[PDB]
Every structure is written in C-alpha cells, then in structure tokens.
Amino acid sequence: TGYDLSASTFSPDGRVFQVEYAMKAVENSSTAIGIRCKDGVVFGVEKLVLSKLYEEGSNKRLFNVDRHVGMAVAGLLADARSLADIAREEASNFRSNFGYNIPLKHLADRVAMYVHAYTLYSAVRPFGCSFMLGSYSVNDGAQLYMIDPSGVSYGYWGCAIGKARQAAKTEIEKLQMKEMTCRDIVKEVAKIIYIVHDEVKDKAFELELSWVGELTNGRHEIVPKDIREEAEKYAKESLK
Amino acid sequence: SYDRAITVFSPDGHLFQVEYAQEAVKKGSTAVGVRGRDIVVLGVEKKSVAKLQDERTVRKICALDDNVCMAFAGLTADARIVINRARVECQSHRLTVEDPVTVEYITRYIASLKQRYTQSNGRRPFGISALIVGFDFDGTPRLYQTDPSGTYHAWKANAIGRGAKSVREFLEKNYTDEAIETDDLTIKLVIKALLEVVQSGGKNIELAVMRRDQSLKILNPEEIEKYVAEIEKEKEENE
Amino acid sequence: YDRGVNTFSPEGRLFQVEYAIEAIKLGSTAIGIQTSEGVCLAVEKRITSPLMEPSSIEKIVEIDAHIGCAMSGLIADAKTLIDKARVETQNHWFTYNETMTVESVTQAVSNLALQFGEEDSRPFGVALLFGGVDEKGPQLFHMDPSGTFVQCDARAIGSASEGAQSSLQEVYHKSMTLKEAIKSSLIILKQVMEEKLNATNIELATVQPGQNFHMFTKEELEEVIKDI
Amino acid sequence: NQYDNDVTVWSPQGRIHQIEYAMEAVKQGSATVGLKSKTHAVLVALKRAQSELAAHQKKILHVDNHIGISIAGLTADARLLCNFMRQECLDSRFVFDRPLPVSRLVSLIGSKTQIPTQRYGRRPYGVGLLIAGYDDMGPHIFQTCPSANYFDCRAMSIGARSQSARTYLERHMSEFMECNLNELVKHGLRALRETLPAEQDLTTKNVSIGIVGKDLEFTIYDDDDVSPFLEGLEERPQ
Amino acid sequence: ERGYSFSLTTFSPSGKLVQIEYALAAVAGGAPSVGIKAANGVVLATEKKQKSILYDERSVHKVEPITKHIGLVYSGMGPDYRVLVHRARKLAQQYYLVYQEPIPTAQLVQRVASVMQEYTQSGGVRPFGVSLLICGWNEGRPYLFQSDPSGAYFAWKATAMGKNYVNGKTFLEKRYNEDLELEDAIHTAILTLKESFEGQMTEDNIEVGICNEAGFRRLTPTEVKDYLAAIA
Amino acid sequence: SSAGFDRHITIFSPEGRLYQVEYAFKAINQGGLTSVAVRGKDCAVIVTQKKVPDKLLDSSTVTHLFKITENIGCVMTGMTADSRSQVQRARYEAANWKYKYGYEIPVDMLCKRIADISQVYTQNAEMRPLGCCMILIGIDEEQGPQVYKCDPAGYYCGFKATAAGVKQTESTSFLEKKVKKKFDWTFEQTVETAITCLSTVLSIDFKPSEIEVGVVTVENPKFRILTEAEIDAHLVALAE
Amino acid sequence: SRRYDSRTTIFSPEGRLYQVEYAMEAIGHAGTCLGILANDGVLLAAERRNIHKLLDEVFFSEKIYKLNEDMACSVAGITSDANVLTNELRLIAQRYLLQYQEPIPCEQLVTALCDIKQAYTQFGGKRPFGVSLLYIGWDKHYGFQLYQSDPSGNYGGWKATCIGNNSAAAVSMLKQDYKEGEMTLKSALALAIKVLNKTMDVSKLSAEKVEIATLTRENGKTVIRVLKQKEVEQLIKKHEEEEAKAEREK
Amino acid sequence: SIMSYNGGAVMAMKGKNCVAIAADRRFGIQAQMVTTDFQKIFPMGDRLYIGLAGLATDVQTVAQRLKFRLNLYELKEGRQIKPYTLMSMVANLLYEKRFGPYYTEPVIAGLDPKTFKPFICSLDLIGCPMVTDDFVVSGTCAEQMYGMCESLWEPNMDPDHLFETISQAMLNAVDRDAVSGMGVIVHIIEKDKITTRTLKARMD
C-alpha cells in the first residue's frame, strides 16, 4: 500500500483513492432526491429521526443559497454547510460586481472549481459531500445541477444522492416530468421516498420538501404544511 | 520558512534532542575553572597542537567585556556565534544602565537564549556548555556554567568536557580553604587538576588568570614549565 | 512511526500533553498550604555537589509584592512563564490602577500553556503553585502542563507527590495557624527527601495579609528546624 | 494502522478517525444535562474534584445576559472557544445594538471549528458545548461536538455515563412543556441522580444550575443557593 | 498554497548526491547531439526523429537562439528545456538594460548554471534533467560551453551528449584538430551523428545551427539537404 | 528500478524514469472515451463521441467541446474534473494576451503557456499533475489551419492527424496509412475521414446522437459546433 | 508532508550529526589543494582533475579564485556549490570597502563566510555545502596569512595544509620537512613540487596536471600571479635532477 | 540653489591620441572655504577617470557606490571596463533615484583600452548621457567655460598644446566665478604614461 494516503499521489494504475474514499462517505447519508417539473424544481429529503430528544426542524439538510437558488445536501454535515457558505458568498459578489442575479451554469461552475481545488494537495482533504442545486428563472426556465466530491457537475431532469441511489432513480424515470406542473410532482416526490428505507433499518423518519418556480414567483422556499400533509395523505396508498 | 517541531517529548518525559546534545559536549576538550578570593583562574586543557598552525586562532578563552571571560566545550561552530551575540548584548547594556555588566546578568542572557532555542520551530539545540568567569563591581569573584538545556548555575570549582566526572571527583577531595591562600597557590590546584585528566604534560595546557583588575593574561609555556616542575617536586618528596 | 505533535490517542486524550505530565515527576518536591492566617510555601533544592553554590538556584520566586510562586519539573522553561506573569500584573496595574487578583494571574498563564503548533512547538514541562493574598483573603492555586488550574488547600507537587499528599490529608484542618502550618510542612519534607534536613537544603516563603511577600533566609529559618 | 495519524487522511471506509477520537475526549468529562420548558431553559452540571481538599472544577460559564454554556472535555480548548463566544456577542451588540440570536451564534461556531478539521497538522477542538439561550422565539437547547456538527434539541445530556440520563429524558419529555421552574429543575436533577453510582448523589458541592428566563437574566447558582432547589427530592429507590 | 521548504537532495553515507546521479541518467537517455568549434565559428547539431509521419516537424525546434549571437541546444527531457530557455532569454535582457551591450557567452553560463545549482538545493524540488551546449562569437574568438544538472560547466573544443556519447567522444578525438573551417566542421558533425542515427538521415531528421562573426543563425532545411548530400 | 519515495512523488528513479507522470497518462484512459482531430487543406475538424447512459440526464450538458476564444476551440479527454479546470486557465490566458499585446493570440503560443503551467506540477513535489489531455484547433494567418496537443507532462507538438484516449494507438495506425497515400483533402473529405476513423476502430456504425463535431474553416474562422441535423447530412452521405 | 521530510538538521543518538560528516567524507575525494608560507609570499598548489585532451583551458585558472584585490582562495569539493560561495564572499569584501573605505583584513572575511556556512547546518531543513577551501592573503595587521575552512563552519590559521585525496599522507610529510620562518619563496616552491609528487598517483608530474599561484607583496600592488606553464616544467625537472643525485649518493 | 551650495567645476577635453581632465580644489559652504584639497577626480582603472561636481555629499557618495559596482564587474568578468560601458553603468545608478536624485553631474574621460582612442561624455543629475568630440563641462561656472572652449579648441592637438589650452580655459573661467577656485589640478592621460599637474592660480 502507501499509494492511498495523500491526495497528491496517483496509484500505479492511475487513480486517486482519497477522492474515492471520500465518495464512500456519501453512501452513509440517507437520501436526497430532486426532480424538476415543467416549470420549476422540487427537492425532497427524507430525514432520519435518530432519537426522540431532537426537535422537529433541527439540523436541516436542505439549505437556501440565494433568493432563487436552492441546495439539498447529502454527506458529512459539517462540510455541507461549509460549502453552503462559500456558495452563498459567491452569489453576493456576482450581484455586487455585475448587477444582476447569478445564473446557474456559472454558479455551479464557480463552486465546483472550489471543490476541485482540494483534490490536488497534501495539505487539505477532499470534501465528504455531494449536493444538488436547483432554481428557476423567467428568462432561463428551471435548472438542476449536481456536484460530486470530485468536482464534476452535470445537468439532470432528476437526480438522487444518498444510500439507495440506484434504488431511488429507478422510479424517477417511471415519471413524466417533461409535462407535469409542480403541483402533482409534490405528491410524486414523496411517494418514491416512501417505498425506500424499509422499517427494519429505521424506526421512524421525517419528510422534508422544497419548492421553487414561478408558482413561488421565482423565490425559493419550503412547501406549506397543508400541501405536504396531502403527500402524507398520499403515503399509505403504496401498500396495494 | 521551515516549520517543524524538532525537540519533542519522549514517552517517559525526556527531550531526546537535548540529551543527545549533552553527548556532543561530553567529547569536547576539558575546561577547568576555580575561583580564588582575589584572582580567578580558569584554563582549558587538550590544546592538541600540530606545530603547523597559528596558535591564536585555536583559542577557546575569549572575553565578552573587560571583566568577563568565557570558556567552553562542545563543538566550536555553535560556540562562536553564541559569543558574538553575547558581545552585542553586553554592549547594549552600556547604552542603557550605565554600570558595566555584572557576571550574573550575562549568563541569564545566554541561558535564556539557549532555552527558547530548544522551543522554536525547525532548530536543533546548541551543543555547547560554557564557563563564565568574572569579578564584578565591588570585587566579588564568582563563576557560573551553562547546561545545553539552559540552566545557569554557580559553582566554586567546576570542569566540563571529555573526562569531567573524574576531575570533579578530584576537586571535591582537594578544594580546601588554604588551597586558595595565595595567587600562585590556586594555580597549583588547576595544574594539578588537569594533570589528573587527559595527559597534557605541560605541552597541551593553557591557563589564563585574572587578578580582578586586569584583563585576561595568558602565561606562555615557560611558567607552566616552571609550575609543573614544582608541582611534581612536592609530589617527588612527600612520596 | 512518527505522529505529529497534535494527535489524539485512540483512548482520546493526546500524546505530548500526557507525556509532559510524566516529566514533572522528575523535579524536586514542593509543598504549599493555604491557611486563613496566610499562605506558607516550601521546596527542597536537591544539592548535587559540595562545590556547588547553594543560593544560586531557587524555586520560590515572586511575581508581585503579594504573589509568590513555586516551580517543579523542568526549570529552564519555567523562567518564560514567570516573566509573562510579571508583565501581566504590571499591565493590569498600569491601566486599572489596582492589583490583579491571584486567580486572574493564573488563567493569564494557563491560556499561554497550550499554544504550540505548526503556525505563527511543544508544551511546557513545568508545574506551578501560586500563593497570594488578594481581597478575598489568602489563596492557593495549582496549574498544569495541560493548562488546567484549580484552587487547592494543601497541594504537594514533585517527585514525592503522592507520598506527601497521603501524609498531608491527615494533618490538615480548616483552622490551622501559620506558625504550625510551617512546622507541619517541614515534617513532610524531612520524610521524603534524600539528604538530612538543614538550613541549606530547603527554603521557605510566606505571604500574610498585613505584610508583603516575605522569603526566609538562613538566620530565621533554622529556629524552626531546631524546634521541629 | 496507517490511516490513523492525521486529520487529512480518509479511511478506506470513509471515516476520519481523528474526528472519532475527539469524541472520546468528551466522553471522559463529567455529565451535564440541559432541558427547556415553553418559557425557560435549564442546564444542570455535575462537578468533579481530584482530592477532597482541592476545589471542584466549575463547568457552567456566563457568555451574555441571555446565553450560557456548559462544557465537557479539556478545559483549555473550552476557554479558547468561550473567548471567541464572548467576542462575537458584544460586537454585534456594538454594531446593531441588539442581543445576538442564539441560532445565529452557533452557526459561527460550526464554521469556526470546521476549519482545523480539514487543514494539515491541526487538531479538532475537543469540547462538548451545551448552549441554552433566548431568541425572540423562546428558549433553545443546542449541543455541539468536535465534528463541528451542531444539533437543535429539546433535551440532551453529554459526558461520562450519559446514556442512562437520556433514557430518563425520553420517558418524561411529555411533561417538560408545561411545568414551571420549580419541578422543571428537579426533573433535570432526577437525570443526574440516574448517572451516578449507587451510594452518593447530590451533596450540594458538586452540582451547579443555570437558568435563563422569560423575565430572568441568565444566572448561575453555586453550592449555597443550590440548597433551595436541591431539597424536596425523594430517596433513590432500591 | 505554500511549499515544502526542505531539501529532498541529501548526502549519501558514501558522500554522493544521489538525485544528481539519477538526473544524469535521464540526460544519457536523451537524443544524441554533437558540438564542434573550429577557428571561426561553432557548429551545433542535434538529432530529431518524429515518432510517426503524423507529426509536423516544422513546429518545434531544438536549436534555439538566445540573442543575436548565442545559440543553445540540449540533450535531456523536453519540458525542462523550455523552462531554462525562457529564463536565459530574460537574463540576457537584464544584462543589456544595464550595460547597453550584448552579454558575453561566458557571463551567460555564469548565470544559467547558477540557476540550476540554486534549483538543486532549495526546498521541495527535483533537479533539472537536461545538459546544455552554448555557442557564441564574442570579441572575435568563438566559444563552446557545456553545463550539467549539477550546476557545473566546462569549456570544450568538441563534445557529444546523449546516447552513445562515450562513442562520440572517441570519434571526435580521432577526427578533430585545431585547424578547420566552419563548413569543414559541419561535415564532421554530420559524420559523427551518423554513428548512432537510424537508416535514413534526411533534411528533417537533423537540425544544425551555426555561429559566425555575423552572428548566430539556424540552417533552413534546404541547405541542410546540401550538407547531407556528399556525406559519409 | 525504485529507490526511496520515487513511486509516490515526482522525483527520479535510479533508471532515470519518474513514475508519477507515467502513472498519469493512463489516468486519461479511465474516461472510456476517444477523440480524433484531423487537419485539412483549408479546415480543421474535431470529432468525438459522447456516452449518455441515462434518460434522466440532460444531454445538452455533456459536451467535451469547449470554446476557448472566438476563433479557438478545444476538446478535452481524461477525467472530467481536471479537464474543466484546465479550460478555465486557457480562457484566462487568452484574455490576457489580448489585453497586454492588443491582438488575437496564436494557437501555438496558447499551447505553450498551457504546457508551461503543466510543467510546474511535475516539477514541485507537492502538487498532483492533472491527469487530462488537451487538443486545440484554429486558423492562423500565413499558416492555414493547425492542430496542437498538450499532454500532462508538459510536452506539445503540432500534428496533422491526432487521436487521444482509450483507442489512441489503433486510431493513429489507421490515420498514418490514410495520410501517406497523399490524397488531397477538401472540407467534406476531412469530415468523412475523421468519422470513419473511429467508426472502424470502435466498430459502432452509429446514428447522429452519440458524436459531436467542432470545426473551423478559412471562410468562416469562427469555432462552431455542428447541429445534429447537419451531422446527419454527412452521415447518410458516408453510406454510399 | 512530514512523511517525506529527511530531517537534515537533528542530532544522532551518539551525540554527533550525520549530515556534515557525509559531506566531510565527500571532501576527502575529488581534488587536491595545498598551501605553504614562511616568509614574503604564499603559494597555492592545486592539482587538476579533468585532464581530457579536448578542453580550452581558459578563465585564467581552474580552482583559483581572486576574491579581493589582495587575497585569493583555492576550493575543493562540489564545484557547483563552490561557485555560489565564491561570489558570496566576493561582495562581502566589497560591502566592507563600501562601509569603511579600507581593504578587508583576511581573517574576518573568513569568519563572515563561515557564519553563513554554519547556519545551514543548524536550521532551515537544508542540505549543507560540501565545500572546504583555503585562503591566502595579506593585510597590514599580520602580513601573510593562511586559512582553512570546513563544511561544519569552523576555520583555523595554518602554515601548511592539504585537503587532497591523500591529504593525511601529505600533512605527515609536511611536518617532516619545514622550517619556521626560513622557507623563502623558492624553497617553498621546491617543497611544493615534492609533496604533490607523492600524493598524486599519476607519476612523472605532467606540467598541465597542476596549477600554482603565488601572492607576493609589491609596495602597493600585492601581486597575485598564476605562474604559466612554461616555468612549471623547469621546476618539475629541477626536482628530478636532484633526486637522481640524492638517491645514487646514498 | 542646491548646486551652488558648495560650487565646483569639471572640464574634459579631447586631444589627438590623448585626453585631459581638470577640476578645482575648493571645498566650502556658501561663502566660506574650509579646505583647498578636496578631491573631485577619481580613478576608475588605468587610463580612465571620472570627475564629479555638485553637492559635496553626493560627490563622495556616488564615487563609492560606483566603485562598489565596478570591482564586482572586473572580478566577475576577467577584463577591465570599456569607457563606453561605464557610461551606461553610471546612468543606471542615477536613474534608480529618479525621485530621490543625487545632486551631481559626472564627467567621464578615458582611452579605449584595446584601440587607444579617447572618449568623453557627461550626464545630468538623472542620467542623460551626451557624448561629444571636443569638450564637456560641468559645474556652477558652466557658461564661462563655454566661452573658453568654443574659442580655444583645435581638432588635432598634441599633449603639449592640449595642456596649454585646458589650462587657459580653466584659469580664466574659474577666476570669473565666485564660489569656485583656490587651485586647479589637471590630469592628462595617454597610452604610455599619465601626468598630473597643479596650476598656479589665484588664491583670492
């Protein structure tokens, strides 16, 4: 061995294991899915109740970067909200210098280069987080990007990060997100995260949803309570 | 900027780089010093002459001021930069407080320079020990020494270098009150002490006396030949 | 093979902070006792050679007129912490025109005690006792290489620490007097040291509410020895 | 093990061990319990000593008039964050002239402690802060950890032998959002008698209680004024 | 970020700087190159084989000018060469902005070799893997110098670097004398590169630059075919 | 063959080799991807494939063709996170040429500045030397079209036909037999001889949705990316 | 990053330090230089190493470097490390002259360089210099002087010293043939060719294999003269004429 | 002004195969002499001199920084400096203090070492070099020295008549100046020897 201690050494077949070891820390965080509808993006995070002592609304795995940009994370939570600070700080310098709201193809480009810069040196480690970015503009439509711990970003019509990643995006392509508005989506986001994580491994869990589009007038915010109670009314009909 | 902890603790509480440096002292040449009530006398042994070199460039007794002499052992490369930093400090004292430097003050400068240097980043400790000898104001002759860890420490008689345990065990059975009776009688203690060390039969010894008002005065190898005659002559008749 | 200087144990403590706790078991023993009449505070010298001058070494040194100290473990790096404590009491006098209390001296040193690293290099291998009389009466504190300080009533620090701490819990009570607390400590030092006790192996220093920091010398000290 | 030397090095499983070893440091300190009502936030600590003549090591500290903390771990790192904690409260009071909100304070702590968990030759902060305070939204109980992951909670307990204290809080947390300050405290005092050996409990010299209150500035009670709170508790059933 | 700030080139217990010894092995595995001065100018010649027919041979150049009158070839690895060319381009300019005079060829080798010594002692770097051959005609008399990755330099009449350099130096010893013209030195420099080349030596397999009192220049492939004609 | 830490950092082996660079050439091959560039008489064509495995992924964000300047385009092989960071340098270095010197940068001077940056990574013993390759095309006056490759060792050369990736050696054996029969090359012939290069090496016989073609020509020197409709025009004319 | 560090500065558990002793092991091989003085004048005799038949033999010397207007040095060891030390103490002598408007004494030029050389052995995490070197010169305080430096950083005055490959063979013969203050600068030249006749294994003493430079005091000149290759070989055979007579008559 | 704080005058003149340089001897502060042996002409190798005039500090300061850079040049290279090369060296030295300038104006005179050809030039206080073929002057009494040299210089002059011309040019122009005088020293160099003479001037 010895070829996998630093992030500055290639393997004798040419790959960095410190990045691949940090990717393995993502599959212990639970599940964060997000699909974009015809006219908006809907996030969704299923949230483990570790003990009864915590408070409903603690330690949110679903951030708010700019007025229109949203973030849902999966990984090591201290590194997640550290990336959420620089992305929130990067969007401020765009507006203060260029005058208008930052677009997503540039915003996910600036963050991913900051993530990539920690996979070159022995002095730092790679981040242990993967996350998603989604927004809506009236001149651009909806956008949905995703960033791995290596620093690779792409666009998606729907993606998933967590433990059961393939078991979640199996059912995403059963949907038809090209035509659905972001009202029927909210019932379908919650349904596909109910069929995952059987009650053997986890006792109880918590739904946490997010929501952006022109129905939210471009601003990013959480769903109201009554709409996600309809999705939890749409919970126990997957047993047929 | 080389930032690395050189001196670290051991799992039983020692500083290995400090006590490795104390063995570099333990194979430098022997330096002996006693003090009389009016004239101090210190003198190195093991000059180890090769009769083709300049005799003044090899000296190990130097002066920091008019009143303060200094001898050392260990490796000579680190020695003469501690001296040159001590000459600056004892000179800048005169720009401050007007009296000349007391002999106790300059050892606290050397020992505190030597300690914090076993504390910094990327610096091996010094590998020298010293003997600082001076007769201060109000004519009080006294001496000190400096461990490489930086513990200044006064004495009545001392000896460092290669073969220092045997000489110190020799002085405790030999340092009486009447051994410092006369000025020429205290010198007969030192020449008897260094002869009880690595051989130095009048050809490898270099004493240097100071009579509390002069500077240092190296006697040439004629009185040392005169003193080693009478030091053996008293031993010739008693036994 | 080589860790850093900044590495946790699998048991969780550290390595070189715990190693420095081992280093203060090699120093000379020291005893301080807090009494409502005042703080007495003693040490041995551990004289090595007959040719050595005895008064050149010291363990008791003063910080201010009303605060004394006592050191153990290594000595050469104790002189750094003493000098930081002296400057700290003068900056407090300069700006506030009063005397810094005994507790707030100690945390000013204890914040310095754990600051090694690889920026801006090892912990300090000393252990200190702080005797003083502030406005809350006489006080006695004890810091650590780890930077932990706590008020004690009768603390024994050195190579003979746990042997003295057992014999010190049986003689102390809350209503001592200073004349007998001095006599009680020299009985403990007489048991634990190597050589016989005289007026040169040890030294004492007391601080009272009335007078300032006073250190005994070789004339008023041996009356307690002959009347032990 | 070669994966167990520096904070930078990932494990082949994906678990940095130097963070996990700092979790052992908070399990060595003595226990403390925090909990809240609708209008109050109470944290109760359990002091330790070394000998019977040395004093007990205090744990509850005063940060601001509406924020107090409780420590568990090595105390020198605790004062390094506490001096950061005081500084960030009074400059916001210097600039905006308002008390800094509690939930926004802890996000500064999580950013402060995450930085040495990613550089080279930098240890994590081994400390166990329980935070109790007031926003405009009432009481808050927060905990942190050396992994820089802070948790919002309504009752927690950290330190040595703290799992028995959590089992007491789960079967009594239906009552916490109703009671006044009197039996809110001696609910929390019944948690500390759970985390002790079966002979000594609460002898008025090893316990400290702090309350921040809806009309009450944050106040620390020590070893004489504890005695009104500490009386009125039943004997340990055995 | 920051650097390492420690030398990774230390003394062996046998007293040999091992990384400099290994860097000379990379020099010996390079392309062969010969250089001959003869009484009015210096001839530098190298050996340039593309790996396939797809490469454009008129794109990069081995023989490089430094100023009006100083040329420079190498035998080592590729990308390390282009670094200390650009360094040597600049060092000739700070000499000229002070003294208003073209730099002597001896003073250029003083300053290029002082880079490589400074680069084999400082922290966190491996030494270069090239040797150099530097020509020029300053004050009538021509010059021919050779540096190494250690930082030393020499003054040769004729030498060879690269593969089979121990066979090239024996060949030059039986051929070179003190009295040759420039065009006679060209014919004996192609004759010594023919000792180790492939089967066909065309006008683009080699690259020759010359110095005169008229200054340094590099031969176009037209007359290189003329010198390659009537050879051997 | 090995002594010291020469397997781990960029120092010399006893044989004169150094392994961390030649470990990084076969980090290019882990993409599973191959690109071909062919220079013509008055044009230059880059062709490369794209592999879209999911229907949930947006097919418009997986382009390996990048527009460096208005007249210079490039294709990237190797790993994705290092390739996109290197494009960010080339966009930056070209803008400083225009600001300092007042005219459009030549394509060989741009490739020299990239290789000098990549040289430093294999020169200091701290950094990791960016395991991805680089191929540029462009029109230069009094030179016609010209193609350059930069590898992560710092080497570069001008080519006439170029392959890079997994099937590099099989494609260059194809192209050197194609060029040495010395046929003249029009616009449509260079497009035909570049598609049929990797269509016979990979043996796919694809449809217009898997490849993407960038081009430059001396009648419109803008770097432009071909539409799938006009790729299909070349593709059905290839099957006579 | 701390795994790749070699720790060129720490001690060894036996007390000494390894890194300069390996450099003083490399100073044993690769070169031979010697000096001698007893009267007006001082000489440096150096032995050339590269004696290949294709070299230009320029730059006025090979191992002799004129430092000041009235002193020079001979060097041994790593030649690339030698060039950096030479043009380092060359401007120490000039910044002395800029400051005091007086030529530098020969002794405190050596102490200035040997403090720079000592610092690399002491901190910085740096390879030391594998260079030892001689010093000849003149000053008004002591006249003709002769010094020797070491890679450890300690110097010394001398009367005759060699740092060759068989330096210990030469020093044992120098203290068998000498006279304190009476060897004028012809007997010293005669004694120099006798010593390097022995320590050079290549016999017969080819006149191009050695270099000799002298420093004689002319009233305001202090002439440093590298004597040419036309008067070496007559001094070679002058040793060869007497040795046939001294052997046969004994 | 600043240049008139101490006075001074330096003249160089080109001959056939020779070149002469002359300067005054007075050192003083605005009205008051101090000494009459102040050196203003400094040697820079054989057969190559430099004269400095202006503020008496920068006369002694620049002549020591220039000697500092010259000895490093002649030891790094194996040869003496050409007269043209020193002109570029001084012009570098003055231009570095572009905004902190030295208040002096150098005059360089010497023979080219290989082909023994004379060379004269002069520089302003920020280093604009001006080479001529007849004469250059610098100092406070400049305009008096132009009336001498424009009327007395001849193209091809042996070193005897070159000495007589530069002597009569200095003894009359400096006599008309108030803050310059108290003696004149004249160096006349050539390829075989070098000659220093001091003139009998008015000590008035």
The amino acid sitting at A177 is M
Phi, psi of E207, deg, nearest 5: -155, 120
Residue G14: partners with Cβ closer than 8 Å, 6 or more residues away: B20, B23
Let me know how long chain B is.
Answer: 239
Residue E187: partners with Cβ closer than 8 Å, 6 or more residues away: E227, E231
Put simply, the answer to whether G94 touches H71 (Cβ < 8 Å) is: yes
Closest CB from G154, G171, G175 relative to B77: G154
Let me know how long chain E is.
Answer: 232
**According to DSSP H, which parts of chain C are helical?**
16-23, 78-96, 102-110, 161-168, 178-192, 222-226
Closest CB from G15, G114, G175 relative to B24: G15
Reference C205, options C189, C196, C217, C195; nearest CA is C217
CA atoms F111, F113, F116, F120: torsion sign: negative
Residue at token pair 């008015």: H202
Put simply, the answer to whether G94 touches H64 (Cβ < 8 Å) is: no
Instruction: Please give the torsion angle defined by the CA atoms of residues A103, A108, A114 and A115, in that order, rounded to the nearest 10 degrees.
Output: 170
Does the beta carbon of A124 lie under 8 angstroms from any beta carbon of chain G?
Answer: no
Nearest CA in chain A to E3: A123
CA-based angle A224:A228:A230, to the nearest 5? 120
Which residue(s) pair with C141 in the sheet? C130, C151
Residue E108: partners with Cβ closer than 8 Å, 6 or more residues away: E66, E70, E88, E91, E92, E134, E136
Helix (H) or strand (E) holding F91: helix F80-101
- CATH code of residue E129: 3.60.20.10
Q: How far apart (Å, rounded) are the C-alpha atoms in residues A61 and A193? A: 15
- The per-residue b/e assignment along D218-233, b for 16 or more CB within 10 angstroms, e otherwise, is beebbeeebeebbeee
Is it the case that chain A and chain H have 3 or more CB pairs lying under 8 Å apart?
no
Reference B170, options B143, B193, B136, B139; nearest CA is B193
Chain G environment of F4 (Cβ under 8 Å): none
Q: How far apart (Å, rounded) are the C-alpha atoms in residues G184 and H12? A: 48
Please count the structural domains in chain E.
1
Q: B-E interface: how many C-beta pairs under 8 angstroms?
A: 6
Question: Are residues A57 and A205 in contact, defined by beta-carbon separation less than 8 angstroms?
Answer: no
Q: How far apart (Å, rounded) are the C-alpha atoms in residues C99 and A3? A: 60
Q: How far apart (Å, rounded) are the C-alpha atoms in residues D162 and B218? A: 76
Question: Best of E1, E2, E4, E5 to disrupt the B interface by mutation (most B CBs within 10 Å)?
Answer: E5
Q: How far apart (Å, rounded) are the C-alpha atoms in residues A143 and A135? A: 5
> How close does chain A come to E152, measured CA to CA in Å?
33
H164: tokens are 């007589």
Residues preceding gaps in chain D (C to N > 2.5 Å):
none
Question: Are residues B205 and B45 in contact, defined by beta-carbon separation less than 8 angstroms?
Answer: yes
Between β-strands F72-75 and F65-67, what pairing exists: parallel, antiparallel or unpaired? antiparallel
CA atoms D192, D197, D200, D206: torsion sign: negative
Domains and CATH numbers, chain H: 1-204 (3.60.20.10)
Does the beta carbon of G171 lie under 8 angstroms from any beta carbon of chain B?
Answer: yes
Helix, strand, coil % over all residues of chain F, rounded to 5? 35, 25, 40
Chain centroid to Cα G153, Å, comes to 15
B225: helix, coil or strand?
helix
Burial class (CB within 10 angstroms; exposed 0-12, middle 13-18, buried 19+) of H178: exposed
Q: How far apart (Å, rounded) are the C-alpha atoms in residues E170 and E34? A: 12
Q: How far apart (Å, rounded) are the C-alpha atoms in residues D70 and D60? A: 5
Is it the case that chain D and chain A have 3 or more CB pairs lying under 8 Å apart?
yes
Q: Where are the domains of chain A?
A: 1-240
Reference E167, options E177, E175, E178; nearest CA is E175
CA-based angle B174:B178:B180, to the nearest 5? 85
Centre a 10 Å sphere on the Cβ of residue A215 and count the other Cβ atoms it contains.
14
Chain centroid to Cα F179, Å, comes to 19
Closest CB from E8, E52, E82 relative to F11: E8
> How close does chain H come to E94, measured CA to CA in Å?
12
Reference H119, options H72, H22, H50; nearest CA is H50
Nearest CA in chain B to G9: B124
The amino acid sitting at A1 is T
C228: helix, coil or strand?
coil
The amino acid sitting at B59 is R
B199: tokens are 């051989």
Long-range contacts formed by C151-155: CB under 8 A, 24+ apart: C151/C103, C151/D54, C151/D55, C152/C32, C152/C34, C152/D51, C152/D53, C152/D54, C152/D55, C153/C33, C153/C34, C153/D53, C153/D54, C154/C31, C154/C32, C154/C33, C154/C34, C154/D53, C155/C31, C155/C32, C155/C129, C155/D54
Chain E environment of A118 (Cβ under 8 Å): none
Range of the domain at E69: 1-232
Put simply, the answer to whether D55 touches C152 (Cβ < 8 Å) is: yes
Q: What is the three-state SS of G211-232? A: EEEEEECCCCCCEEEECCCCCH
Helices G92-100, H56-76: crossing angle, 10 deg rounding:
160
Question: Are residues G226 and G213 in contact, defined by beta-carbon separation less than 8 angstroms?
Answer: yes
CA-based angle E135:E138:E139, to the nearest 5? 150
Residue at token pair 């670290």: B8
Q: What is the three-state SS of chain A? A: CCCCCCCCCCCCCCCCHHHHHHHHCHHHCCEEEEEEECCEEEEEEEEECCCCCECCCCCCCEEECCCCCEEEEEECHHHHHHHHHHHHHHHHHHHHHHCCCCCHHHHHHHHHHHHHCCCCCCCCCCCCEEEEEEEEECCCEEEEEEECCCCCEEEECEEEEECCCHHHHHHHCCCCCCCCCCCHHHHHHHHHCCCCCCCCCCCCEEEEEEEEEHHHCCCCEECCHHHHHHHHHCCCCCCC
DSSP secondary structure letter of residue D33: E
Does the beta carbon of E114 lie under 8 angstroms from any beta carbon of chain G?
Answer: yes
Helix (H) or strand (E) holding G143: strand G143-148
Helix (H) or strand (E) holding B190: helix B183-195
A87: tokens are 């992305």
Question: Are residues D225 and D65 in contact, defined by beta-carbon separation less than 8 angstroms?
Answer: no
Does the beta carbon of B176 lie under 8 angstroms from any beta carbon of chain G?
Answer: no
What resolution (Å)? 3.0
Q: How far apart (Å, rounded) are the C-alpha atoms in residues E171 and F146? A: 41
The CATH number given to A1-240 is 3.60.20.10
Method: cryo-EM
